[PDB]
Amino acid sequence: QKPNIILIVADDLGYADVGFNGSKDIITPNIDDLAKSGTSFSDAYVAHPFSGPSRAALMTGRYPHKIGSQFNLPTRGSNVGVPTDAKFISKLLNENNYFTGALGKWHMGDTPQHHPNKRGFDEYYGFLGGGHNYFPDQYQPQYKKQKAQGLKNIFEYITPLEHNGKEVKETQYITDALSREAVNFVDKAVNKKHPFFLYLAYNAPHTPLQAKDEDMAMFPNIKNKDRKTYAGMVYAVDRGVGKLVEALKKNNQYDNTLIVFMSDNGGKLSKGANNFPLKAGKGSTQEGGFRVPMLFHWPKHVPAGKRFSHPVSALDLYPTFAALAGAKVEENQHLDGTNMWPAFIKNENPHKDEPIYALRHRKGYSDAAIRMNQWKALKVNQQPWQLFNIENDISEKHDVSKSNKALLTDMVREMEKWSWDNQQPSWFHETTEGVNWRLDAMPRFDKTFKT
Amino acid sequence: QKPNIILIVADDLGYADVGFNGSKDIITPNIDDLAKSGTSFSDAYVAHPFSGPSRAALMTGRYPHKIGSQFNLPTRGSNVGVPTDAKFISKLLNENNYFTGALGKWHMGDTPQHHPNKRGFDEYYGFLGGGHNYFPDQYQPQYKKQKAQGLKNIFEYITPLEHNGKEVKETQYITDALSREAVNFVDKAVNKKHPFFLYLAYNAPHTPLQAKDEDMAMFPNIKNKDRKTYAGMVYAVDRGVGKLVEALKKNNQYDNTLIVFMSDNGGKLSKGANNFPLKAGKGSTQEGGFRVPMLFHWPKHVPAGKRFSHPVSALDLYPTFAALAGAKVEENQHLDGTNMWPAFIKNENPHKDEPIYALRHRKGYSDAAIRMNQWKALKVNQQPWQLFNIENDISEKHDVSKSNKALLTDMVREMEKWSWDNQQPSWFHETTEGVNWRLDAMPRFDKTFKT
Amino acid sequence: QKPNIILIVADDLGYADVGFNGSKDIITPNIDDLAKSGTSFSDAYVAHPFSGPSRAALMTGRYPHKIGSQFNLPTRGSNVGVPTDAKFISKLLNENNYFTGALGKWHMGDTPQHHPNKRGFDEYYGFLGGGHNYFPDQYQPQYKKQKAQGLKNIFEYITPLEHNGKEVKETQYITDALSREAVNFVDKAVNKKHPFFLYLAYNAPHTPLQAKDEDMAMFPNIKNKDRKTYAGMVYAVDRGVGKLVEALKKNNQYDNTLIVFMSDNGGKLSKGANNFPLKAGKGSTQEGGFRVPMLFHWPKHVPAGKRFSHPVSALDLYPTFAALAGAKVEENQHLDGTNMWPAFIKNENPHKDEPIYALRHRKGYSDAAIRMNQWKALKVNQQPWQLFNIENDISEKHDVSKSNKALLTDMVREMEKWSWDNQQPSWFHETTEGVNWRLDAMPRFDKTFKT
């Protein structure tokens, strides 16, 4: 009965950089097959416009602000991570008889208690930090040189990958390696006789921009060097997905597996991405920062060849997966999303008359976003709040706040109300950021929620 | 054996605005009956000079500073409240076989976990915020208009009352409605065969100043408009108390019930109150802010026709009620008051040689108060500490700090010692207040405890 | 089988002020006997360069920064202390069948929950604060005068000593009294038939500088008044140790007891100490502040007549004692030291390629220290980081940072990484210190970890 679940998350994948979500230049046949025989989502949102807090939200089902995880972890390492008392969806599923696997990027804490194996994943194969260099032939010599020199703070992008806490010596381009271990994970799952949960966290197409020549060779008409490199990186993810689907079919897992494919946040335009038709990109509270491609694939359950047009949150995956797995959630987990399945099946808005938030901190102020029904409220760059009918003005060109004053004020005040149980950040991505936070009396919600 | 307990709390009731505590113009016959056949308290103190933290202290038996509840909750709503790990007196009594009821004003959190029904009250009938408009005929149309317009942040003074989480349509003037449900609560209690605890939290005579014509008609010689309205509001509370006593007598509950009547803080002089002979009023650390009327009534147990002249704290009610109920308290609850009954029965000071504190935060500084034996230390308006022999100088006219230097310094240093386990505020009543707190490096206890 | 353990800690004992660690003027025959038949440590470090946080670290096995105890407790008293959820080594040993005793200075909280008897000591005889006056004849009349005057905030240096919460009337010079009760403790231990742990926390030679004439008489060639007084104070500790060893031999405990003797921090040069050949003293992150004398004595187990030359931390005592006692440690205790015994027995560095830290907060900035293998990194007085080859430059005269840039930067970045799970201080030693902390947006780790 109970389905296997695969959550595939690309890292900094631009909105228009898969074929099912409008790519004209990058070609993603295998990812598009899953979209063509499943349902894609035109209004899918992550809980934060960059990696660490977005991933924290995927795993915990909570806005990262509620659990002190509003910032990326310190870039040079730390002994902190996403709080251990917020149960990960993997742990919940593992407690309900799932064989659990995590692959690739973690970015949620690298201490013993924060490690994938202590957050409910039986299997982990990957790198624990914010990304990685893609070619072992490049990074392994650099790590050797630095380690032999006696350095202990070695940049996490060149450190060896690990398998369940034991270091390995990777031989393949990282995207191919993660795809290979996805196949290995689902092949191991055959014998288990319970259902499985796989969290596949590709670092592609996140920087550094490094692609195989064989992949870049498939895009001879992309003349921009970065865009061709980026295209090659995305194509490697597509090959990977193809290799995984192959294995699922061989093992007779394909038909009873829910596959979710998405990005952790918007594309970085200066590093090869395209977020058309959305404004801006990674880190923004404009749509381009936190509105992402998403597809569901599960034959006979997810309708084939459809596009779901109502708002869905990455926060919804926790209770949705939980309900589909027959795993009970507790009220004291304070889940911020909803089980979207009943509304999804009726082609209705699972967040009818309810807001979806983004709140991204900057130096001495915060940018914010509110999506509810047709409306997108926007607080950016210390401008006054703006309002867009996002259903007809997806690119956020036509501020209609002047003619909907009471509605806008109401949305902002509800966000203000929501903000009070946000915890003080438990860390920042740089030491100076934490010092500035304190110096600036943050959060400056007097500015953020001013109407 | 074990007595029923009723805690009646008026909201912003002035010190001289009941007959038993010296009113010459407002007439409160039923409240005065309870005083005449019981004991009133000339030196009764609440733990904070305004609502939210005072109520937090009544329920938890802790100074609100110890539990992060030094401020009123955000006026436009929030998902925060008085910490769930500080057990409410209602919860303790409920755990020891009491049928528990709360009526009227809450002001201690409106989330599911902070709701009266989750803080140990079997029955709740009231409004969860800081107050309410008094006439359904006035507020219900306003709420209809706003709700039909699609507004979600609706001012809590016009929102519908509820009964155990289900919304109701109130038909009576709020003070009469709460009195009616007090009767209903004690009538329900007859069948239960356990003792009962009723927390009756009238919003009268708190703003808005709104009275029935029939009540105002009883004060033809009060020419000041606000004072007449206020008098009418207090008279409605007296009628209510009378209606409740009536029901207690009918049910044979009267003789074995401990009735406590008090205010949550001092009267607001600009909104109809009189705190004679005390200086200042609501929010002050002068006596007028946190010294309140109080009576106990319990035939054969509380002496009849007496006035107890020693300091008593609202903090004492938790362990006193607990002891009278045979409910065990634990050392790790960190109760800040004392079981006052043994000293009360011997007509001795239950806080002999021990301080009672007030500490009220302002913009960039704090006002403070210390009551111990005959002495009142006062820190106000960024003036140097003052000292009064409050037994001979109740109006705080004669600063004798110059001639008791060592005593004053000693009292202040003991308060400074007490301040270290005060928690940072978990919320503020406005966003800007919290920003100013952070900007001003609060608490500025270098100013507050300077000698 | 399992050994008794005695941890003797002098308070502000200078580096060169015992004979085994190079004293030419102070003579410490009994302490030197333990060194001569045991192993002394040339590179022994406490976790903080002053009392409260150093002691917190000894007892918890954690850097005090991890548990909010980076500052001394408020000098005029408080209701805070070292967190009750960090299990004390005494509690652990008590749970593993040890008879436990603490003597003399506590300085880790004086509330019921923070009291020695609630932190795993069966016996406590001493004073709970930061120090004490040494002559009962002097302090007892002062305390009587103040107590009879009705003062409640009485300076903790004159308050009566206590035995398990009950006040006593001490008749001897405090150092002699503590020594006497050490004898009484080990005599009580004879009957118990389990092993024992004694924590002997002398306040000597900490201020006030007060010595017996009979002790000062032994140093006729010390002409400096303070140095002679200080010498006499240290000699009283030596007599005490001699009296204790006497009792251990009488009771047949000597041979199966591990005796550790050390200081809580470096000597205060302006109050009689000598830290030769180390730079600076008490409170500094120069070697003189946190590098201390230390000896182990345990016949047949600790080699006799040796000097161990590798870094050892006071943090190591918790897991080392635990392992020697057969007491299990849990991963979730987050111990910061190591069981040094296996490396110690092989004459190898128990902190090979691993740092030992000091981080001491000042007004608006922090001083820091890193010891790893031959290297000492130093951050002091808001100067740029310095680096010394501490093995050939113990006095920190020759900054070689210019020629080891990459190593120094790497060490600092590793400290920066370590800093993220440091908690905000739960208290300060003065109210103004806490206000300045907040005003200065502390910690200013942007300055501290700048390279």
Ligand SMILES: O=S(=O)(O)O[C@@H]1[C@H](O)[C@@H](O)[C@H](O[C@@H]2[C@@H]3OC[C@H]2O[C@H](O[C@@H]2[C@@H](O)[C@H](O[C@@H]4[C@@H]5OC[C@H]4O[C@H](O[C@@H]4[C@@H](O)[C@H](O)O[C@H](CO)[C@@H]4OS(=O)(=O)O)[C@@H]5O)O[C@H](CO)[C@@H]2OS(=O)(=O)O)[C@@H]3O)O[C@@H]1CO
């Ligand atoms: O004032 S501050 O607060 O401190 O900082 C600025 C601003 O105020 C911040 O609020 C803002 O926030 C950003 C968001 O959260 C943290 C900030 O950056 C995040 O995105 C990260 C992404 O930019 C980064 O990409 C890096 C580049 O490629 C990989 C990463 O490291 C590389 O550089 C290294 C180099 O340092 C080393 O010495 O040599 C290496 C050689 O291989 C390498 O160079 S390279 O490989 O040739 O490129 C590049 O800079 O990745 C991180 C994750 O690791 C973040 O991505 S993600 O995880 O968020 O998806 C957010 O956008 O930042 C302001 C300035 O930091």
Ligand SMILES: O=S(=O)(O)O[C@@H]1[C@H](O)[C@@H](O)[C@H](O[C@@H]2[C@@H]3OC[C@H]2O[C@H](O[C@@H]2[C@@H](O)[C@H](O[C@@H]4[C@@H]5OC[C@H]4O[C@H](O[C@@H]4[C@@H](O)[C@H](O)O[C@H](CO)[C@@H]4OS(=O)(=O)O)[C@@H]5O)O[C@H](CO)[C@@H]2OS(=O)(=O)O)[C@@H]3O)O[C@@H]1CO
């Ligand atoms: O500027 S700040 O830093 O943010 O704060 C200032 C200062 O620094 C603070 O120390 C000080 O603290 C005060 C104390 O705690 C919070 C502050 O106010 C508290 O008292 C509250 C009480 O004033 C308030 O009364 C209001 C008036 O009557 C009812 C309440 O709302 C009314 O107005 C509404 C109106 O806004 C709405 O649009 O229409 C309604 C219907 O027309 C209604 O109008 S009405 O017809 O007049 O009723 C009035 O303004 O009630 C709250 C509880 O609900 C507090 O009372 S109590 O719970 O504490 O007993 C404390 O004194 O605040 C400074 C800035 O105010």
Ligand SMILES: O=S(=O)(O)O[C@@H]1[C@H](O)[C@@H](O)[C@H](O[C@@H]2[C@@H]3OC[C@H]2O[C@H](O[C@@H]2[C@@H](O)[C@H](O[C@@H]4[C@@H]5OC[C@H]4O[C@H](O)[C@@H]5O)O[C@H](CO)[C@@H]2OS(=O)(=O)O)[C@@H]3O)O[C@@H]1CO
């Ligand atoms: O208040 S501040 O302006 O913030 O303090 C400043 C600095 O900013 C701050 O960093 C520094 O911190 C000192 C450090 O920790 C607290 C401060 O004092 C400690 O040492 C103490 C001894 O000096 C004190 O000795 C006193 C002396 O003899 C006995 C004591 O009282 C007598 O009256 C006499 O003055 O004893 C303390 C323990 O009781 C403590 O000693 S301990 O070994 O640390 O316990 C330490 O250096 O303080 C600056 C100004 O004070």
Ligand SMILES: NC(=[NH2+])NCCC[C@H](N)C(=O)O
């Ligand atoms: N396991 C040990 N304790 N080894 C250290 C040497 C022990 C040896 N008996 C000695 O006293 O020198």
Ligand SMILES: [Ca+2]
């Ligand atoms: Ca990303």
Ligand SMILES: [Ca+2]
């Ligand atoms: Ca009030």
Ligand SMILES: [Ca+2]
């Ligand atoms: Ca010391």
Ligand SMILES: [Cl-]
């Ligand atoms: Cl710190």
